[PDB]
């Protein structure tokens, strides 16, 4: 009867939908490959989808996926076993080399632009009308690492203009230079800013940006990656 007809129709439909949905999520990272970088044997039952091209605004060009997947960067790791499936120990400073939790992706070395073609992010001292409207103002507060020592002090807040959101804390270290810390990675307390991930002696190790008024997608990734990996790697200092 109709009911029984409709119910089966639906299962066929749902199948096509799970097919479509799966092949759509294969536009990146695929085709799988061995630990050595060569294409793996079995690629699963799903076939890469036909490629699609995005038209990045502001004349930034285009993007086609799926497309040639490259890491466009060196990886300081070495196998730890003869068989597949084991960890790949770092061959240097995981933090410096940027591997594991300290990993970063080689993204465009330009900044994100708002719907107007302007740098989506700016240091607040260059943003008009922008001011800390609520909460404690970190500017001026000193910054502490996970070893209870002071790394430097906040000198300004880098904000997102279109979404009016704090994103980074430009910190001034002992030698006069600055570093950006992810807003999502620090505890702004009453009389300081606490950084749990890294430990004093590592704040200098954080990557630095070229221009002092804009961060690029790439530099954001190295700054963010570097601090996150400080969660695992820095530990041999994070007493507290």
């Amino acid at each position: 009867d109709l009911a029984s007809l409709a119910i089966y129709s639906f299962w066929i439909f749902l199948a096509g939908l799970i097919y479509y949905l799966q092949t759509e999520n294969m536009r990146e990272g695929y085709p799988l490959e061995n630990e050595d970088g060569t294409p793996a044997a079995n690629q699963g039952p799903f076939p890469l989808p036909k490629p699609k091209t995005f038209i990045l605004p502001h004349g930034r060009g285009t993007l086609t996926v799926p497309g040639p997947e490259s890491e466009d960067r060196p990886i300081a790791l070495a196998r730890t076993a003869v068989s597949e499936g084991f960890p790949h120990a770092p061959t240097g400073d995981p933090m410096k080399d940027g591997v594991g939790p300290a990993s970063w992706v080689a993204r465009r070395d330009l900044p994100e632009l708002d719907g107007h073609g302007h740098n989506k992010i700016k240091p607040m001292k260059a943003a008009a009308g922008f001011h800390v409207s609520a909460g404690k103002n970190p500017i001026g507060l000193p910054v502490r690492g996970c070893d209870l020592e002071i790394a430097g002090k906040v000198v300004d807040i880098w904000v997102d203009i279109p979404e009016q959101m704090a994103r980074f804390l430009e910190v001034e270290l002992k030698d006069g230079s600055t570093r950006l810390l992810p807003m999502q990675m620090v505890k702004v307390q009453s009389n300081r800013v606490h950084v749990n991930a890294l430990s004093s002696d590592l704040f200098a190790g954080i990557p630095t940006i070229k221009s002092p008024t804009e961060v690029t997608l790439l530099e954001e990734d190295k700054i963010c990656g570097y601090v996150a990996g400080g969660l695992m790697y820095a530990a041999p200092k994070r007493k507290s």
Binding site: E71, E84, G100, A228, G229
Partner: protein, 281 residues
């Protein structure tokens, strides 16, 4: 077995127990000590459910159903045939669910990301123990727990429900249904939003978060934002389940009459209790 960008992440460490022992993969699957535990508690259980099937003399899935000890056994153990297997399988299930959670924590530690996922999972695991552990123990009888069966467990829902009249009247159950509905509203929207910006009309430029915040203001006057909608999503969700675990911990323990009757408190208020007319009076 690896995605183009995966190797740099497969570094040593992150484990909570055993150290380098189980710190390794198996295809895309990460293992870890807790990856073993879940296998253990899952193979054990499935077996118990298989055995429990022969004792019921049925292999059919739309029929098999491991029932809990009868109300007479109270909160004591029961014969493997009279709720015993059930009681044990519940332990395996709980243990499989917990081990899984902690496994995520380790997958988290390795990737250097927050613990929001394993945390939000714990709310489900919570609702589960609310049905098979807290409500029953407070009511002193493993019999108030639900059965393990495709439809047979649906009956349990229906019976337990009509035991208090239209269960629609449970105040919390009323709040939980709202968050569940809202959550679907919010998920449906967020997806249509992001997608309609990354996939604009043919040949046009990919919009930006800006066009998104714009679109909503035009439509509803406000726009929570890209970080907010993801905050709203996690919240609407865990709430819907919190209130669901709540409307059931109070039912049969502190309130055991018809739920439609609980609204008398309202209607029977001094100021209007006797005020003639209306629907009540």
């Amino acid at each position: 077995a690896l995605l183009s960008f995966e190797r740099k992440y497969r570094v040593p460490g992150g484990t909570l127990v055993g150290g380098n022992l189980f710190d390794f993969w198996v295809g895309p699957f990460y293992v870890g000590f807790f990856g073993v535990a879940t296998f253990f508690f899952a193979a054990l259980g499935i077996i118990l459910i298989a055995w429990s099937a022969v004792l019921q003399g049925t292999w059919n899935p739309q029929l098999i159903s491991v029932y809990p000890p009868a109300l007479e056994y109270g909160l004591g153990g029961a014969p493997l045939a009279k709720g015993g297997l059930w009681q044990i399988i519940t332990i395996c299930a709980t243990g499989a669910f917990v081990s899984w959670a902690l496994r995520e924590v380790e997958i988290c530690r390795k990737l250097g990301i927050g613990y929001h996922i394993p945390f939000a999972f714990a709310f489900a695991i919570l609702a589960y123990l609310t049905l098979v552990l807290f409500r029953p123990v407070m009511m002193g009888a493993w019999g108030y727990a639900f059965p393990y069966g495709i439809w047979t467990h649906l009956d349990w829902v229906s019976n337990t429900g009509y035991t208090y009249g239209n269960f629609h009247y449970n105040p919390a159950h009323m709040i939980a249904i709202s968050f569940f509905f809202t959550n679907a509203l919010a998920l449906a929207l967020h997806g249509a939003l992001v997608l309609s910006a990354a996939n604009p009309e043919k040949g046009k430029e990919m919009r930006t978060p800006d066009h998104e915040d714009t679109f909503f203001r035009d439509l509803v006057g406000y726009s929570i934002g890209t970080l907010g909608i993801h905050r709203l999503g996690l919240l609407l969700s865990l709430s819907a389940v919190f209130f669901s675990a709540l409307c059931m911990i109070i039912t049969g323990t502190i309130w055991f009459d018809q739920w439609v009757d609980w609204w008398q408190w309202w209607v029977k208020l001094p100021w209007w209790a006797n005020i003639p007319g209306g629907i009540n009076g």
